């Protein structure tokens, strides 16, 4: 057997409610580690984390700056390439541009109506993409002006849950055969793929229930898609009649994340976090349920927390899961191969 076992790293706490979004630093000079962690939660707060080198006590790190601009929950965060800037989606019908050194909000994006579930940052950093319960995807100048809004003929029924982008690697030698696209996942169970011009390129009806999250392989060759459908769908951008691969992950799918290198898929689920190996065909490579540190409070027992977010650090060695109890948990992997 190839055993992939998990060593517990630590605990990042002080998020009052849920942990809805997590982003880790971009690798700046190549193959070097990311010092930076940012989370977003219900709690009305964006947390900036200063990380311990080793682990002291049971903790992996300590809260550095708490960004407060927001009325309702923070749905999703995204980083600039600079790593010096972050952005916040919210149910408060607004987006925010955050300087990461100062607590300062730079500009805020207004003009969304209902509420905002996700945001994406384009590789050029001059385009912001935002989506919400308006069944609408919006394109913003970094100066805070709505540039475009996808219309009825294209846009999908119910709510856009998540929008993301299609990485173009640095070297041209990294083999980019396709066109640039952006992907939109929804509560109608539709995975959409649009060109830069906001023209529908490929819209497949992926799921039977609703889709909470979508992420793209670092290669931009495949898409991972998931929600209440209790199914993890992997799609080849070459042949779409049939989904590339499918996995059964217990109960409901909250988040999905590709290992920036390692070629695994980590899935945030109510039961816990599952990790899939794409290199072999088997259905459950590493499974983590987490008992509650808040349960250690005397007399109160948990049903377990459910994990509301995932992120990998740039090196792909560390993994962060945001939870129901407002605690981020950190885990590392040791390989024992028989």
């Amino acid at each position: 057997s190839l055993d992939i076992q998990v060593v517990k790293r630590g605990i990042l706490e002080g998020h009052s409610d849920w942990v809805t979004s997590i982003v880790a630093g971009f690798s700046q000079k190549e193959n070097e580690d990311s010092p930076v962690l940012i989370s977003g939660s219900r709690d009305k707060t964006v947390m900036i984390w200063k990380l311990y080198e080793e682990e002291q006590n049971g903790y992996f790190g300590i809260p550095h700056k708490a960004l407060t601009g927001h009325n309702h929950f923070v749905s999703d965060l995204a980083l600039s390439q600079e790593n010096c800037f972050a952005i916040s989606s919210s149910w408060d019908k607004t987006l925010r541009l955050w300087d990461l050194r100062t607590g300062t909000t730079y500009k805020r994006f207004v003009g969304h109506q209902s509420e905002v579930y996700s945001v994406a940052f384009s590789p050029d950093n001059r385009q912001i993409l935002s989506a919400g319960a308006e069944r609408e995807i919006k394109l913003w100048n970094i100066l805070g002006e709505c540039k475009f809004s996808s219309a009825e003929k294209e846009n999908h029924s119910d709510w856009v849950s998540c929008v993301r982008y299609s990485p173009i690697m640095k070297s041209a030698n990294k083999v980019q055969p396709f066109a640039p696209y952006f992907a939109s996942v929804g509560w109608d169970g539709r995975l959409k793929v649009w060109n830069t011009n906001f023209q529908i390129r490929y819209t497949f009806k992926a799921h039977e229930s609703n889709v909470n999250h979508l992420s793209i392989s670092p290669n931009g060759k495949y898409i991972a898609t998931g929600g209440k459908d209790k199914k993890l769908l992997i799609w080849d951008i070459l042949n779409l009649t049939y989904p590339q691969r499918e996995f059964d992950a217990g109960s409901t799918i909250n988040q999905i994340a590709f290992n920036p290198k390692l070629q695994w898929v980590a899935v945030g689920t109510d039961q816990g976090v599952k990790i899939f190996n794409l290199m072999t065909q088997s259905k459950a490579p590493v499974c983590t349920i987490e008992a509650e540190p808040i349960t250690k409070a005397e007399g109160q027992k948990g049903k377990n927390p459910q994990c509301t977010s995932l992120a990998w650090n740039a090196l792909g060695k560390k993994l962060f899961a945001g939870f129901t109890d407002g605690v981020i948990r950190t885990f590392s992997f040791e390989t024992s191969a028989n």
Binding site: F73, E115, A133, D158, W187, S209, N210, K228
Partner: protein, 64 residues
Amino acid sequence: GRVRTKTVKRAAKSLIEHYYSKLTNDFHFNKKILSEVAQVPSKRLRNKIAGFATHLMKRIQKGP
């Protein structure tokens, strides 16, 4: 005095009846779901309906 009324329980029944596949254990989700799905004249009302419907989602998860 927290007993819930006719209007609210009829409402909750209906909301689950048509929408069960869309509905979550989270109140805050279900209240927005309701808002989109229905005509509810009050904030207060909608919230009561959503709360009871949530309650019933949890009761459904357990059995009949």
